[PDB]
Amino acid sequence: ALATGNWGAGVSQVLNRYTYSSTLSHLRRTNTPIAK
Amino acid sequence: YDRKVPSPTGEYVKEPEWVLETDGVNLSEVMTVPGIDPTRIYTNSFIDIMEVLGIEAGRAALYKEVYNVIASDGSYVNYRHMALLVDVMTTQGGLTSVTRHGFNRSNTGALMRCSFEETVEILFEAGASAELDDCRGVSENVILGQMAPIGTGAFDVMI
Amino acid sequence: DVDPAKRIRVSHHATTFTHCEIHPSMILGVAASIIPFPDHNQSPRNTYQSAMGKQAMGVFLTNYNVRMDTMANILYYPQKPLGTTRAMEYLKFRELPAGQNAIVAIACYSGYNQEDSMIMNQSSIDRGLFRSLFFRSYMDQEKKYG
Amino acid sequence: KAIPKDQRATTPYMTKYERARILGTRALQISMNAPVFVDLEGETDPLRIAMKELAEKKIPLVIRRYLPDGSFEDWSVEELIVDL
Amino acid sequence: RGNLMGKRVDFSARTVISGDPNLELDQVGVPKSIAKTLTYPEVVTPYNIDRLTQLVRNGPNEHPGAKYVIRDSGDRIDLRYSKRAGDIQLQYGWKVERHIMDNDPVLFNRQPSLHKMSMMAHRVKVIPYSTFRLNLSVTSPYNADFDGDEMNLHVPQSEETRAELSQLCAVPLQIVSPQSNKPCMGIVQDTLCGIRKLTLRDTFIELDQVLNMLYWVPDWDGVIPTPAIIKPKPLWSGKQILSVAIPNGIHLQRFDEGTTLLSPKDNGMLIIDGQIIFGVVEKKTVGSSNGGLIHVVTREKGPQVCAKLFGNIQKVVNFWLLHNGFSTGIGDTIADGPTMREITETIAEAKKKVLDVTKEAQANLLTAKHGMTLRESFEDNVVRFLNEARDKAGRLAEVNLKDLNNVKQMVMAGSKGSFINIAQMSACVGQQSVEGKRIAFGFVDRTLPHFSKDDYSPESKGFVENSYLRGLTPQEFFFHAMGGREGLIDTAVKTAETGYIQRRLVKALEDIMVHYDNTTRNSLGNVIQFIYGEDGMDAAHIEKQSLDTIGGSDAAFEKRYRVDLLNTDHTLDPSLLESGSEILGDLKLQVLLDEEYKQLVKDRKFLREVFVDGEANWPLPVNIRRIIQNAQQTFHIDHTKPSDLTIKDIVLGVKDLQENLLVLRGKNEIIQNAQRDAVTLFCCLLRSRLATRRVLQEYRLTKQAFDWVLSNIEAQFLRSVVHPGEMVGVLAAQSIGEPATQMTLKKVTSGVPRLKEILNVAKNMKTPSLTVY
Amino acid sequence: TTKIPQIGDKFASRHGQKGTIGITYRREDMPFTAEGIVPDLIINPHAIPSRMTVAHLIECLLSKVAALSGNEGDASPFTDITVEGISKLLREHGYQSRGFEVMYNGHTGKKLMAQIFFGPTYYQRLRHMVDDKIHARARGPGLRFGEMERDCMIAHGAASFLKERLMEASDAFRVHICGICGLMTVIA
Amino acid sequence: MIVPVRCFSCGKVVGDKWESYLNLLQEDELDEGTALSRLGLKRYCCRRMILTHVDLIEKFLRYNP
Amino acid sequence: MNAPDRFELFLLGEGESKLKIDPDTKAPNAVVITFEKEDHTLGNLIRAELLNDRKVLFAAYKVEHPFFARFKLRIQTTEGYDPKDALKNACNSIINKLGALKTNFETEWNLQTL
Amino acid sequence: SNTLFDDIFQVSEVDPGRYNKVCRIEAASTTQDQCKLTLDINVELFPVAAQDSLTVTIASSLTRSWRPPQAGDRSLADDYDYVMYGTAYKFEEVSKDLIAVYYSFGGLLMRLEGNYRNLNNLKQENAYLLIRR
Amino acid sequence: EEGPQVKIREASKDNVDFILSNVDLAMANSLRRVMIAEIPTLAIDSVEVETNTTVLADEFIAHRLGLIPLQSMDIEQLEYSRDCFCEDHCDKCSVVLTLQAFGESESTTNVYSKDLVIVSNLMGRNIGHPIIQDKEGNGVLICKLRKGQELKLTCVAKKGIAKEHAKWGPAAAIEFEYDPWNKLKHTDYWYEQDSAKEWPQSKNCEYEDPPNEGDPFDYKAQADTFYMNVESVGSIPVDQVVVRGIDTLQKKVASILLALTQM
Ligand SMILES: [Mg+2]
Ligand SMILES: [Zn+2]
Ligand SMILES: [Zn+2]
Ligand SMILES: [Zn+2]
């Protein structure tokens, strides 16, 4: 699951590392599957 | 509304007039209502114009409509183009949509983009029902190593 | 009496206040916290710049030399920005900056910087302006259940 | 299904697609060391050359214009007026 | 099938584009490395062995080189690994797949390709670095910018294929597109900005610079124009030399709001014999407009000469701009102290009205509009007050902007900028909105937890009173965020839904073409249009012209076209005509004139039955107005001596011409009518322009100038007919679908949503409506 | 590797406006200040209005200040920092308050008629550089040619080009066909 | 990563001043603005060079091998 | 990768000559010299000098593209005065002038204290 | 080898509408109330102001490429100070007993009102405008 | 004493303020460009690396080494490798230095440009010598070593010119100006109310007479007198840049005269 991201999808991703802030920004991220 | 109209002296004159704009439609029953000029009555539902005034009217409507969409953006486009659209969309006596109607066709052949990778079951079936391919499509002629009968290839050169 | 040069704010018509914001700039996230004067900026532009910060180079860890990962871009000479944010301090931005304080000039010069292209000082590219290191790394193993 | 040299209703002029396919073909032949029917004013390029042979109505080719019904008309490059 | 989708792409390349002011409109810069890679199979020949042999010698890795050599027997000699690379005695018949060289025709395109203009053909020009380079003016047909876009280079592989590119889709041959029915490319950015500056009356150029400019124009004839000023110091006007760039015999007239053959404001535009006489040269004259210098030059001097026109202009104007510079800072976004004051109150009183209208509603004195809610008509009124506040605050700001203000300068030239920008930057930003309403109460009965419930004031529901220069407040920053976001969400949609439509339209018409019977059918042979566009014409040879005959009073109509030889007063004063004195009374001639005048009247009636508007300006082939000015100075006609023109020459000349226009040639009853039809409107224009009085009293033509004009019109008319083969099916589709991929926004469905509604023939439309008269 | 700024490379300030390099000039060609300062970057004034990207302008003005005085410029959002106050500080430093500066043309040495917004701004260096995207396939004996570019070519009416592209160079073969039953049953 | 040797924009050698600089600050308790001017860094191009520098080589050194 | 060697700005390649003199066609007594491996330094300088000669009817220069360190110079002179000679004079003058400047500057420098 | 117009004018107005170097001079001739002039001048190389009595001449003389010095000691149609060159474009019936004239000098405009000129004013390009004192 | 004349306002080991009068803007300008890019100088242009346990990469270090200024007064007699007949380099077209530094103490070892050691025969000519204008004498900080990190290098410096690479730049930054009062009118000042009050004033104004309220524009005046000030990185004496710069530009124009000859 943690390797793939397919619980049972998109969860779990390779931590961003181009810039220090881009990494912070990645750990602070959110996602919404699928009326406004 | 304003309305350039001819003057008895000849010049066009801005002769303002009262018009009612409606938020709902019932063309059939409003033309009849007395007090209105049943000649100039209009709707932006070309589908209703067609049903009440005939496809030729519908064609004009459909154009008048397509026009406004573009015009409303300040844009302009030559009549010949939208006209052609409006015609294709009409030649069959009724209003035909183009945002893909059929799941198979619109105006193609049994070879262009042989999709489905079933050029297998398609060829078997094409043999069954003696199919006659016109070969006027670019990619069908590709498979024959020919130019399609378009622009540059719409005529033969000879000795 | 009121400094004209300052933005116009409404008032405090309230005697029912239950709470008070620690600070309003705390409504931005990591990305946005790095934008200078995002409040004097058109709405969307801030969303573009938020996305691009991620496409930027610079030190991302003071231990890049000891790490072995598919690609890593380090900026030869990172530089803390002259214009900053009271929020950049917690995002340790001045420590691991991305970016460099370039001496810009807004002008029509040779016609070589239209439709978003820039004219860049060659002589400075030489003295080190914007050079970066690029580190790619491949990897392999041996057989399986054979 | 053929149409006599008289009764031809098609255009007297050469369309750009026709003048474009002729120069093409001709140019090709020239590139293939073919007999040239013009006096080069010192021109080296084949296309360039074909434009000149077209210019001097010296191209023995005939354009067969097909109507959508199936019938056709044959016009000799030579006749076709070349304005454009 | 993997080949039909162009998967296996051979002889192509792709990289980042970057503009170049020194490349010609029709070139494309190719990085040397890419050129060494893309090849062309060239057969050996008595006229190229020298060259071809040198390329083979240069080898696979020295630019004007080559890779593989192919012999008679289809053998493939690889010039990189071959014991006989330093040999090879090339032979007539063999093929040398050379490297790509300068001037080779190549297909260049940017995706998505929704045009023809998005896939044009350029002449190669091998260059050093690694980006494809192109002339800025080619920017919009492709719809490209330089923030990193990539583009594709394709290389024709046959001698036939090459010609097909150079002769059909070359960049100059596309300058005037058949979609907008006008020029597809104009002058932009720096060049547009500089051409305005360079053109002010105030602008002067002295010898040192005049000479460097003159030389920068390649087609220059080394003839220094005489200074406009020769007094204490010989000085040249910016217009003076920019005219060097303009070819001779190009005539243009403008006339903006207050223009007057004396343009006190330097309004309008007046070019005669390729010499600018008055008017600041900005977007209207040199942009991609309908009557523009470009549209014209193309139709008058040819596409290749127009191609160079972009070049020559961008060379002088861009050189001039280099040594003058242009810039932009904050100073430019600052308004005068008093102006900010007049703005801070303009808003303050705007809030008042909002306040009053609220108290009025809170007292229940508001009377709802028809069909609307007390609530709806309140919002309606309040929104109107705020947009109105935003606009007048803006014009206030826009007004102080000096002629120095760099932003105003970019707005005046027409290269970026607009009221809305200056307004939002310098003065008030505006009312934020979402779903065509002010900020809703996402929280219960309120906007943000920093307000009290049931608060409908402007501050509360989305008004941003500040400017970008002043800065937004937190509450302002968030609403704006909410709006700008909606702008991002549908922009994403409008992008998709359109790309859909565009592809879907091409599917329906992709098979329609114009056949040799001048008809328009599909692959089944079914008739869609008995004559293309109903007139057999080709959109690019059409221009907007005004049919004088429709307009005016019946009186002016008569003072203008009426000729009555049998009547002292209303006849041809003998000053106009040679046989004018001895024509006074010719019975047999009156019959002709009467039959003429009759026809003109029948027409006036016809045009008023077609165009009920009274509207006179419509696109039709052949710009007659021009052909005439092209007779005024081509034969040097003096409006002093009478004409040697016979009343028959005219009447019968104009009458025969019409027998020749011809779009159809069928020698039978039906077709002969079609022919008459397809030409009806155009003749109306013809007859109205070449009417006897006009040709004598309006533009004193001579039997030769006139005989020339006639001859000319016939020619131009025949070049304007559509060529059998034109794939108008695609043209049409692409022509509606591309201008639809630029739309991105009084209560009715418009834009892509509406278009999708229409094209899908949806019976459940969102904004029905009946319009009764 | 060590990647050095090349003509096609990508750069951007922090106001949502990226932009590749379109050429590089040496200090002698670059426009120069009277003090001798010369730019590192030169962006086009034409990229400001339509953007409403005013923060960029402020940041720059504010930065000219910080550098000139060794201070750190506070560009936080909701502060009372004004363009006016910053201009006051800049002016004390002897420079014209809005950031403008008289500059000279590098080729000629003559003055530039317009003064130019000159100062430092923070610019970032974006990845994905040109020498990573130059790909050029040739194998004689996006970048794909899809339905979309095919349509454009049909519009142009380049019939024979479409044949040469979409086809697979498999050397045309010659066959004899019967005119009554289209099968290759002809003994030649 | 180390003081640039030479300022980008003009080339005034700015590599021999890091330490001097950091000293005019610490012990001489000067404001950055005065320190710079005394290191002879008069134009802002040269100033931004030192002022803006982040000496990362210092944390780079802290890793054992 | 597709970048030429820096030394190509000043060092002449193979078969290239500092100068190429083609006779102008448009106007009479006009010439177009092509300077290889030279930029504005020499270009704008000589057009300046050449423009002091009242027998020089036309004189300008251009660098058609900044990628190539080269430039053209056109010179028209009055009838009977070879443009080549016009160039020779300007060049001498440009030198005698720099002769004086180098001299005067050193002088002045020798009186300075510090 | 001619002179086409001579007369002295009394400038009544001098307008500078955002032009830091050019102004619009609208002077009324001396003698004939009929004759009136409208002109654009470079108030930078040749100043002008309230009720000045400027002299004006037209002619077409002292088009092949332009030359500068030498003649400095040869021809001197410099008996004037301000001097322009331009092309003429059209004559308009100002209706009645007066016919006008529009002149364009690379942008600097000029309108002249009178009548005897029909014989004194060219019908072509050439046309210099000279002004003195 | 002829055309171009000089007036020096200040002088030193690094700066020289002077006034050039009786010279066209052109010459004043070229002379300036030449200094900035066409004066020979010696600079490390080759670096061989034996050991690098430093925390910096090889090309990083190398780039800085090429940047370290080196004496160049006698370069006019050192040769361009590309012109020397040797195979690569030699004491006739180069100067070889060596840099060996080892993190000895545990207090962080600093490496300076003074640790460079010339190993080729300088043949008695003053050239190649890390230049140093520091107070403590450490001409530029090359690198920093920790506990026991090494760094063995051999550098070969070659005669070069800015055009090839900015490192061969001996001119730092030139101050240029002319017509401190906009008398000449080569600029249109951007104002907001009062141009003259908004745009500061140049110290050069002090050295020229104001414009006087009602004087008409002097359309015949051209650009004379230029107020410059040449900085110097050290590799060459201030006064030298000016001279050699004038020399170079002088030799250039000379070459065109020779060219027309051979022709
Ligand atoms: Mg883009
Ligand atoms: Zn058979
Ligand atoms: Zn510096
Ligand atoms: Zn050697």
Topology:
The structure is cut from a larger assembly and holds ten protein chains of seven kinds.
Chain B: E1 4-6, E2 12-14, E3 20-21, H1 27-32, E4 42-43, H2 46-53, H3 55-71, H4 79-88, H5 119-128, H6 138-142, E5 156-158
Antiparallel strand pairs in B: 1-2
Helix pairs in contact in B: 2-3, 3-4
Chain D: H1 16-31, H2 46-55, E1 62-66, E2 72-76
Antiparallel strand pairs in D: 1-2
Helix pairs in contact in D: 1-2
Chain G: H1 18-25, H2 32-38, H3 44-51, H4 57-60
Residues 178, 180-181, 185 of chain F line the site of one zinc ion.
User: What is the 3D shape of chain A?
Assistant: flat
Q: What is the strand arrangement across the widest sheet of chain I?
A: 5-9-4-1-2-3-8-7-6
Percent in strands of chain A: under 5%
> What is the CATH homology-level superfamily of chain I?
Nucleic acid-binding proteins
PDB class: transcription
Keywords: transcription, mRNA, multiprotein complex, molecular machine, zinc motifs
Entry title: RNA polymerase II crystal form I at 3.1 a resolution
Chains A, C, F: DNA-directed RNA polymerase II 140KD polypeptide
Structure write-up:
The structure is cut from a larger assembly and holds 10 protein chains of 7 kinds. By secondary structure, chain A is mainly α. Chain A is built from 1 helix and no strands. With 133 residues, chain I is mainly beta. Chain I has a single domain, classed as Nucleic acid-binding proteins (OB fold (Dihydrolipoamide Acetyltransferase, E2P)). In chain I, strands 5-9-4-1-2-3-8-7-6 form a 9-stranded antiparallel sheet, with no helix packed on it. In chain I, a hairpin with a 6-residue loop joins strand 1 (6-15) and strand 2 (22-29). Chain I is globular, with a radius of gyration of 15 Å. Chain J is of the alpha+beta class. Chain J has helices at 25-37, 58-67, 195-198, 238-262; strands at residues 5-11, 15-21, 41-52, 95-102, 109-112, 116-118, 141-145, 150-160, 174-175, 226-231. In chain J, strands 1-2-10-9 form a 4-stranded antiparallel sheet, with helices on one face. In chain J, strand 1 and strand 2 (15-21) form a beta hairpin. The longest helix of chain J is centred in the last third of the chain and has 25 residues, at 238-262. At the E-F interface, strand 1, helix 1, strand 10, helix 4 and helix 5 of E face strand 3, helix 1, helix 3 and helix 4 of F. Strand 3 of chain C pairs antiparallel with strand 9 of chain F, so a sheet runs across the interface. The structure holds magnesium ion and zinc ion (ZN) (3 copies). One zinc ion (ZN) binds next to helix 3 of chain G.
